[PDB]
Design a protein around this ligand. Structure first.
Ligand SMILES: CC(=O)N[C@@H]1[C@@H](O)[C@H](O[C@@H]2O[C@H](CO)[C@H](O)[C@H](O)[C@H]2O)[C@@H](CO)O[C@H]1O
Length: 514
């Protein structure tokens, strides 16, 4: 009835758009999309990954937000998911049927997890004008977007909580129709958004963080069984979109930044996240954990001494892509507790966050890890084999032990550092959320880019800049929408990658170079 003839397909398409993924019959299509949003862009900047190519310095990988690549990013983050969502809206906007009303609120929840990434990447977006038929939509400021999204999520939760029967289980690749689980995802996204805005607007943060956690409202994601992930299933086969860039193009490798933490912390998640690469061959062949540096400057190489044989993220056609896991919830509460948004020892949520992350990665030895005081490992000159590059990731960097401080920051500031750092490790491979959190808090410290002309390409200086502040809108886009002329005003700066977004906290910490 309703699923096969109206929403079913549009809904599955929406789910696949949040983080680029698709059917196997779509070959490398989605991988090219995941590459633009996560692998060679965001994942590259924060150092989750390393590119075995520089593309002639012609795309987002080396911070060259060209007109074509930015139009593509806009599609991947915003417009692609809008089309099917909008159709779902035009078909159910006017229905007394509480069932179709349940379908539209879930579609909205999905569309928001997506547009959250969009706003955190571009800043102002067309949130409120969404679906008003207008030829040229109106953009809202990142602040309005945030406020509206909060109110809308809150509105989805109210209606969805009154629904007690499985909704479109046949097309729900996320929770299989379980409406209670969608309520949790929504509140969990609320908790995310609220923590995001606390430094800027402490009161807005508190208004929603309460609704998000009030038990009467469904609660948040607290068990691995409630996590939101999408993967291949009988309901809809999928080909993990990371494979194209990892195995076919041989361009995505383990990043120098995350390797640095995993290594120096003696993190058992190292083995779970990446494979062991090779260097050379035969006798003098070394087999270890070799990462590729961020914003690589060297061209693609396929020799036995190249990055083609550096460590790769472990992944196969069945691997899933995560939207929101229990571990994040705990780290969010830790930051929340740390700023009096909720009660409880920031430390208890912190450690528990790590414990859950290990359970999700199937590893163990938490107590030993939490006792560690080792510092992240750096990439000095004669250790980086894929060109010349070095960066000391340990300088002024904290360790896993909650009570172990450096003295370089106030205790409150280091505890946040610890939280965001461990959250960074638990978030993997959610490249866009980690990158957003870096730009917001300044943590965890990252390995500087290798391509020194990178900062310059977006209007910034290498001295401080370790990553772009946002993507810019393709200039030609202004020609079709006379409203975009307002973008810079809504941004508070020019439409370039150097401009900071609304939620960047003041005095964002910076690693000491020494
Ligand atoms: C976008 C980017 O810079 N990366 C390219 C990949 O796109 C490319 O794969 C090709 O992509 C085109 C469409 O842009 C088409 O789908 C081709 O069939 C596909 O092979 C890849 C191939 O080696 O290299 C990347 O660096």
């Amino acid at each position: 009835e309703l699923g096969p003839l109206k929403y079913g397909a549009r809904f599955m398409n929406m789910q696949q758009r949040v983080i680029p993924i698709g059917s196997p019959s779509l070959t490398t299509g989605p991988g090219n999309d995941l590459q633009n949003t996560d692998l060679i862009s965001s994942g590259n900047y924060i150092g989750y990954f390393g590119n075995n190519n520089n593309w002639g310095f012609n795309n987002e990988a080396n911070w060259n937000f060209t007109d074509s690549r930015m139009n593509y990013a806009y599609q991947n983050f915003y417009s692609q998911i809008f089309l099917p969502w909008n159709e779902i809206y035009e078909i159910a906007k006017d229905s007394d049927s509480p069932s179709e009303q349940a379908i539209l609120e879930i579609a909205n929840i999905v569309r928001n997890i997506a547009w959250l990434r969009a706003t955190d990447v571009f800043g102002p977006i067309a949130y409120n004008s969404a679906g008003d038929g207008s030829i040229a939509p109106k953009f809202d400021s990142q602040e309005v977007v945030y406020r509206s999204m909060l109110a809308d999520l809150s509105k989805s939760v109210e209606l969805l909580n009154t629904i007690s029967y499985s909704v479109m289980a046949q097309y729900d690749l996320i929770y299989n129709g379980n409406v209670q689980n969608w309520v949790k995802l929504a509140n969990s996204l609320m908790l995310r958004i609220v923590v995001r805005v606390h430094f800027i607007d402490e009161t807005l943060a508190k208004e929603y963080i309460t609704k998000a956690l009030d038990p009467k409202n469904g609660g948040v994601i607290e068990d691995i069984s409630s996590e939101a992930k999408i993967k291949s299933s009988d309901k809809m086969p999928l080909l993990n979109s990371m494979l194209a860039s990892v195995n076919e193009y041989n361009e995505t490798r383990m990043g120098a930044t995350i390797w640095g933490y995993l290594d120096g912390y003696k993190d058992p998640r190292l083995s779970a996240y990446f494979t062991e690469g090779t260097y050379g061959s035969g006798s003098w062949a070394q087999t270890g954990y070799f990462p590729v540096a961020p914003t690589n400057s060297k061209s693609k190489s396929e020799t036995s001494y190249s990055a083609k044989f550096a460590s790769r993220p472990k992944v196969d056609s069945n691997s899933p892509l995560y939207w929101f896991r229990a571990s994040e919830t705990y780290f969010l509460k830790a930051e929340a507790a740390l700023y009096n948004l909720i009660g409880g020892d920031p430390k208890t949520f912190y450690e528990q966050g790590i414990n859950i992350s290990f359970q999700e990665q199937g590893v163990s030895g938490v107590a030993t890890y939490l006792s560690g005081t080792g510092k992240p490992t750096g990439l000095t000159g004669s250790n980086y084999k894929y060109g010349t590059y070095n960066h000391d990731l340990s300088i002024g960097n904290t360790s896993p032990k909650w009570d172990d401080y450096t003295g370089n920051l106030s205790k409150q500031e280091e505890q946040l550092q610890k939280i965001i750092t461990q959250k960074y490790l638990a978030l993997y491979p959610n490249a866009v959320e980690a990158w957003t959190e870096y730009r917001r808090t300044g943590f965890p410290y990252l390995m500087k880019p290798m391509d020194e002309a990178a900062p310059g390409r977006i209007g910034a200086s290498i001295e401080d800049c370790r990553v772009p502040e946002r993507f810019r809108f393709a200039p030609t886009a202004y020609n079709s929408n006379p409203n975009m002329a307002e973008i810079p005003t809504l941004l508070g700066g020019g439409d370039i990658g150097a401009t900071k977004l609304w939620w960047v906290r003041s005095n964002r910490p910076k690693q000491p170079n020494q």
